[PDB]
Amino acid sequence: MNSQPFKLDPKMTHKKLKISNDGLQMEKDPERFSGTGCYGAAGNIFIDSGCHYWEVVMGSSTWYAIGIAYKSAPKNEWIGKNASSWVFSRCNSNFVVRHNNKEMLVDVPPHLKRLGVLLDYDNNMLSFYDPANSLHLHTFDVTFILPVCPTFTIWNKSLMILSGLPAPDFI
């Protein structure tokens, strides 16, 4: 594994997010707001080689999108709705992977609170895992044409980033 620690990039973080001092936690500062306004942030590293693994703790969030993007994705447009963004997304009961405004359903075990992100840049893959259940969720087969940056987007609650990780045994 090539995995290195990274944190959120303050220049790429939505101004309405509360960020921890280590740059690893982001939080939005029975009727709910359905407004599609997302709160996105990008990591402070770009990758164009090697094999990288990180995890995200989603806790109680019910609406989030986690993945990678080229620099060409516009700021705060990291939810798979352009050709520069690849995400795993939850919205309440719906789990998808999304890229270029095209989705595929993902069947996810109940009560997902942690996501694993495996970027095998050299072998043209981005894979999502359920680490609690030690299992594969989805692989994009993609030959990246620019460097990629981790991205993290919420509509509610908070995320925590676990970076610099040894590939768990289920890789």
Domain membership of residue 134 (yes or no) is yes
- Domain encompassing residue 110: 8-162
Domain membership of residue 119 (yes or no) is yes
* Strand 102-105 with 94-99, pairing: antiparallel
Domain membership of residue 109 (yes or no) is yes
Terminus-to-terminus CA distance in the chain, angstroms? Answer: 11
Could you tell me the resolution of this structure in angstroms? 1.6
Eight-state DSSP code of residue 75: T
Domain membership of residue 24 (yes or no) is yes
Q: Give the C-alpha distances (Å, rounded to integers) separating 12 from 34, 49, 105, 147.
A: 24, 22, 29, 16
Number of domains within the chain? 1
Beta bridge partners of 114: 57
Domain membership of residue 171 (yes or no) is no
Would you say 124 and 165 are in contact if contact means Cβ atoms under 8 Å apart?
no
What's 127's domain CATH number? 2.60.120.920
Would you say 24 and 7 are in contact if contact means Cβ atoms under 8 Å apart?
yes
Contacts of 3 (CB under 8 A, 6+ apart): 51, 52, 53, 54, 163, 164, 165, 166, 167
Residue 142 CA to residue 102 CA, distance in Å, equals 14
Q: Which residues of 96-114 are buried (b: 16+ CB within 10 A; e: fewer)?
A: bbbbeeeeeebebeeebeb
Residue 115: both structure tokens together? 């996501």
Q: For 111, phi and psi rounded to 5 degrees?
A: 65, 50
Sign of CA dihedral 107, 62, 12, 73: positive
Domain membership of residue 170 (yes or no) is no
* Strand 25-28 with 94-99, pairing: unpaired
Instruction: Identify the experimental approach.
Output: X-ray
CB atoms within 10 A of CB 37: 9
Domain membership of residue 142 (yes or no) is yes
Contacts of 64 (CB under 8 A, 6+ apart): 58, 89, 90, 152, 153, 154, 155, 159
Residue 37 CA to residue 23 CA, distance in Å, equals 22
Residue 36 CA to residue 75 CA, distance in Å, equals 15
Question: Which H or E run includes 67?
Answer: strand 63-69
CB atoms within 10 A of CB 6: 21
Domain membership of residue 1 (yes or no) is no
Would you say 33 and 111 are in contact if contact means Cβ atoms under 8 Å apart?
no
Would you say 135 and 40 are in contact if contact means Cβ atoms under 8 Å apart?
no
